[PDB]
Amino acid sequence: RPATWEESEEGALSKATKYFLLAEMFRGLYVVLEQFFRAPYTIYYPFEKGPVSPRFR
Amino acid sequence: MSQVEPGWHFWLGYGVDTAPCNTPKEKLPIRAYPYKFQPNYTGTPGAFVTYNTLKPKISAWEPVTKQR
Numbered sequence A: 001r002p003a004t005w006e007e008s009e010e011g012a013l014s015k016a017t018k019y020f021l022l023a024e025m026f027r028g029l030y031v032v033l034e035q036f037f038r039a040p041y042t043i044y045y046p047f048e049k050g051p052v053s054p055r056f057r
Numbered sequence B: 001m002s003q004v005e006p007g008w009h010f011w012l013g014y015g016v017d018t019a020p021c022n023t024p025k026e027k028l029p030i031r032a033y034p035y036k037f038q039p040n041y042t043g044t045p046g047a048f049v050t051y052n053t054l055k056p057k058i059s060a061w062e063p064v065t066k067q068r
C-alpha cells in the first residue's frame, strides 16, 4: 500500500528545503556543467574522416 | 574530398594501418594501362555525359530501287 504523509521519514522542513531550493535541479545543472570541461567528439570533415571498414558499400 | 587519391582515401578513413607509400610491392595492383586520377567534375563542363552503348535493336532497310 502507498504510504501516507504522516508515515514519512523526512521532516517537513527538510522536504521544504529541497522543494524551495531546487536540489535535484541543481544536481542536473552540475552534471550538465561537468560536460562543458570534457573533450568534444567532433571531427573536422573534410580534413578528417570517420571510420571506414573493408566491408563498406 | 573527391581530390584525395584512392588508397589515401582509405588510409585517411582508418581503413588500413600502413600508408600507400609504405605498402610492399606484392600488395599493389598490376596495371597494363596508364593510371589517371580525375576528381568529381560535377557542375563543370567536364561532368559525365551518359549514353547508350548499343546501336538500335532493329536496323531499317537501306532503300534501293530496281528497274522493271
Ligand SMILES: CCCCCCCCCCCCCCCCCC(=O)OC[C@H](COP(=O)(O)OCCN)OC(=O)CCCCCCCCCCCCCCCCC
Pocket: A013, A016, A017, A019, A020, A021, A022, A025, A029
Ligand atoms: C524551507 C523554508 C523556505 C522558506 C521560503 C523560501 C524563500 C524562497 C525560496 C527561493 C526559491 C523559490 C522559487 C522556487 C520554488 C520552487 C517551487 C517548485 O518546486 O515549483 C513546483 C511547481 C509545481 O508545483 P507543485 O504542485 O507544488 O509540485 C509538486 C508536483 N507534484 O513546478 C515548478 O514550477 C518547478 C520549479 C520551477 C523551477 C524553474 C527553473 C528555471 C530556472 C532554474 C533556476 C535555477 C538557477 C539557475 C542559475 C544557474 C546556477 C548557478
